[PDB]
Design a protein around this ligand. Structure first.
Ligand code: ATP
Ligand code: ATP
Ligand code: 33S
Ligand code: 33S
Ligand code: MG
Ligand code: MG
Ligand code: MG
Ligand code: MG
Ligand code: MG
Ligand code: MG
Lengths: 258, 258
């Protein structure tokens, strides 16, 4: 007879985007998909052995290092006061999304506060313009599940000082996404969102903005923040973002429950 | 007159391992070190632009991928039950070191529980022996500060099935550390610690151990866990591990308070 909804969910777990009702019962559809997915893992294991998320991070790192941006690795566990100093008050959606740790810390929901601090300190040492980027874990409590992870990975890059125009911002974005092979449109201090269909890949900002002064920043700047799992989702055409996440249930978008 | 202890602390912050009392007052020692450290940052910014921690991670990744180990990226935020299932009861030192998040989660203090789960699942897909590794953030509350970080980075690798001997374990360790250029001694299921002088670089284990069965593991295995910041500390001869940490105060071991 027809597939149950539960059986269809199970097959959808094992289904990869360009695999492709029939006289075929569940048992045989499942056995066929199990066989294909095991072979996919075997092929990764025999050849490249790289995780997509780690690999994307290395590729993005190369891109920005080669374009003059300094690679930052800053804390993931940050002072809780950075959150209010970011102007995230009980008025904003974000205030409710913070994972708190102990009395005085939290998991960073974005890279911005640490990068603000790096911008100010590095301005004492480095010639104009100051170009930096970080890639790493960020955390947000989320109700939604298809485009949101509670544990995700952000790329943020910033240029500060000379050349901080909207055109140069859009140009970096454009070179970046064409380099990765990802289709996009830019939709618009100035605040621009980089969209893939209805999926937000990035929020980008042309500074200065009034918030800067809280962080001791008094120069023009441009920057953007990207979700790596969203980039992976689009690039590999995963229909659920959980296939692109740090996970025990998926490896390079392949189910590990085989 | 003599340097105050506070002034000496300040200079020690700006002092890098092979920089080198005098008729020289604080102001001029400080200005000289400030000048050298700014130049160090300028040189990084002009040339390589890579963060040491990120770079070490890429180098370690290459090493294990090239030796047949599958690269894993698993959650950092893990179920609290993984901790007790690791046999970390209120009897062990570790139970007191867990950063809890919400009711049911915590920051992983080690990579082992997630890798146990990957070993069991991948054994259904991959040929013997199963070789995997992960590098990423781990978290422990620590009282000590000179060799311990509360936020650090672990490398863990595991081989499971055939070839899981103490000799092959010691051989991987040995090739690994000679590749990185780090001096060590191995000190000794079997439990071995990889030492640099009095500093522990790694705990390594030859399985099986009784804990395996909790995780559905019933094969021989060998593995080890390394602190990346400790490796960096030794390699760059930093006298405090905070120079090797994710930080807003140090960049590649250079003070950012200039
Ligand atoms: N929970 C999440 N899971 C996965 N990626 C995320 C998440 N939150 C943000 N991102 C990514 O980080 C980028 C910058 O963060 P930003 O604060 O602009 O997100 P956002 O505007 O809250 O996104 P959304 O409207 O989709 O919630 C986003 O464009 C998105 O790509
Ligand atoms: N708090 C920490 N900061 C930095 N590195 C750490 C920390 N805890 C563990 N490591 C690194 O992780 C490796 C494996 O973890 P393990 O649980 O064996 O540490 P440990 O035996 O508790 O170390 P120690 O005796 O130094 O506390 C250690 O050999 C060490 O290199
Ligand atoms: N607003 C996003 C992306 C972003 C925008 C501007 C600057 C940066 I640095 C990052 C975020 O930080 O959540
Ligand atoms: N005991 C250390 C290092 C280690 C030892 C054996 C196996 C693995 I995988 C890792 C730890 O996991 O904290
Ligand atoms: Mg949001
Ligand atoms: Mg949005
Ligand atoms: Mg946004
Ligand atoms: Mg310890
Ligand atoms: Mg120990
Ligand atoms: Mg140990």
């Amino acid at each position: 007879p027809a597939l149950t909804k539960s059986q269809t969910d199970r097959l959808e777990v094992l289904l990869n985007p360009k695999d492709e009702n029939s006289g075929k019962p569940f048992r045989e559809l499942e056995s066929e998909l199990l066989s294909r997915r095991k072979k996919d893992l075997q092929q990764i294991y025999a050849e490249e052995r790289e995780n997509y998320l780690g690999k994307l991070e290395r590729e993005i790192t190369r891109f920005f290092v080669d374009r003059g941006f300094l690679e930052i690795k800053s804390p993931i566990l940050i002072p809780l006061e950075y959150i209010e100093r970011m102007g995230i008050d009980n008025d904003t959606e974000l205030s409710k999304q913070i994972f708190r740790v102990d009395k005085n810390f939290c998991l960073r929901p974005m890279l911005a506060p640490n990068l603000y601090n790096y911008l100010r300190k590095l301005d004492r040492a480095l010639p104009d313009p100051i170009k930096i980027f970080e890639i790493g874990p960020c955390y947000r409590k989320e109700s939604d599940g298809k485009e949101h992870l509670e544990e995700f990975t952000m790329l943020s890059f910033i240029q500060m000082g000379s050349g901080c125009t909207r055109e140069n911002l859009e140009s970096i974005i454009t070179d970046f996404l064409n380099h990765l092979g990802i289709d996009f449109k830019i939709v618009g201090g100035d605040t621009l969102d980089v969209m893939h269909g209805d999926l937000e890949l990035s929020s980008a900002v042309v500074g200065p903005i009034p918030l800067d002064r809280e962080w001791g920043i008094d120069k023009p700047w441009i920057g953007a923040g990207f979700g790596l799992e969203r980039l992976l989702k689009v690039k590999h055409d995963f229909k659920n973002i959980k296939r692109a996440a740090r996970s025990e249930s998926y490896y390079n978008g392949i189910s590990t429950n085989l």
